[PDB]
């Protein structure tokens, strides 16, 4: 049983707390928590490569992509490791997060510990937006909040 | 080869950037950067076990101590992995950090990535304070600032 945690903070109203739990060494990871201060709708939700917060989220680098794939959604075969799709905020601006993912890991080459979790301004189009950028980033706009994923008890 | 970074922030105005570089996994880690807003003198400087800053620096847990040793200074055989000693602030409140350490690592079970770096109120007594706490925490007082250590480019 391995656990991780991430506090999401930014320059504006967006903040949250995200927990990760992996029961078995190469098993699925449960992702749960809450993010507040959002606009109602979909917000892109990504693990970026670097746990570099020195310039806030500006510093986090590209999507975590150890297997040199293209951008997609979490249910796609063709995805980056860090492609966790979207979270959904309600009209109160709160997103209750509840994800199970079998590509991210809390150990080894797919490990996300020490990387940056980012929530975005816009929806991630999951590689289905109709331009070149869709296949790289998903066109999810500004980085509203982020944090470094840390080992938890 | 390996690099890591950490932004230290407080509930007060203690701000720092700390870099880690390890040229090979069997080598020392160079720790460099700066911390401002400190009182003149010595401030304890630790890697705490958990990269959990959900409730600020308290969430970070005890000293990182994978080998089940007692507290010391970084030059001691008997130390925790996370025992990096003290940093020194000048009368301008700035500590310029320059450390080489052979016990922390950026890989393996002495790896510090995803853990919390903390700078303290007071001096760590390095195990040489004359009470039982000295052998556990070093009596360095409150956690002034902290952040989660992340993978860098
Ligand atoms: Zn992103
Ligand atoms: Zn992606
Ligand atoms: Zn942004
Ligand atoms: Zn400490
Ligand atoms: Zn210690
Ligand atoms: Zn404190």
From Swiss-Prot, chains A, B:
Source species taxonomy: Eukaryota, Metazoa, Chordata, Craniata, Vertebrata
Which effect does the record note for changing residue 90 to A? In ALS1; does not seem to be linked with a decrease in activity
Domain of life where this protein originates: Eukaryota
- What subunit structure does UniProt give? Homodimer; non-disulfide-linked. Homodimerization may take place via the ditryptophan cross-link at Trp-32. Heterodimer with SOD1. The heterodimer CCS:SOD1 interacts with SLC31A1; this heterotrimer is Cu(1+)-mediated and its maintenance is regulated through SOD1 activation. Interacts with DAOA; the interaction is direct.
Mutation effect (residue 146 to A): Exhibits very slow copper acquisition
Impact after mutating residue 45 to C: In ALS1; slow progression
- Location of Phosphoserine modifications: 98, 102, 105, 107
- Cystine connections: 57-146
InterPro entries reported for this sequence: SOD-like_Cu/Zn_dom_sf, SOD_Cu/Zn_/chaperone, SOD_Cu/Zn_BS, SOD_Cu_Zn_dom
- CDD domains referenced in this protein's UniProt entry, alphabetically: Cu-Zn_Superoxide_Dismutase (cd00305)
List required co-factors.
Cu cation; Zn(2+)
Reactions accelerated catalytically = 2 superoxide + 2 H(+) = H2O2 + O2
Q: What does this protein do?
A: Destroys radicals which are normally produced within the cells and which are toxic to biological systems.
Pfam families under this entry?
Sod_Cu
- This one is known as Superoxide dismutase [Cu-Zn]
Q: How is the cofactor bound?
A: Binds 1 copper ion per subunit. Binds 1 zinc ion per subunit.
Entries under PANTHER family matching the protein: SUPEROXIDE DISMUTASE CU-ZN -RELATED (PTHR10003)
Molecular function terms from GO: copper ion binding; identical protein binding; protein homodimerization activity; protein phosphatase 2B binding; protein-folding chaperone binding; small GTPase binding; superoxide dismutase activity; zinc ion binding
Major localization class: cytoplasm
Q: What is the effect of changing residue 80 to S?
A: Destabilization of dimer and loss of zinc binding
